Amino acid sequence: FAAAAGLXAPQXPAPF
Known part of the structure; x- marks a missing residue:
């Protein structure tokens, strides 16, 4: 989830 936003x-x- 966090990764998605950041990428x-x-x-x-x-x-x-």
């Missing part, structure tokens, strides 16, 4: 997070801007 995803830097790509949050991408759809933008």
Whole structure:
């Protein structure tokens, strides 16, 4: 769970 958030997070801007 924690891992998921941490690995995803830097790509949050991408759809933008």
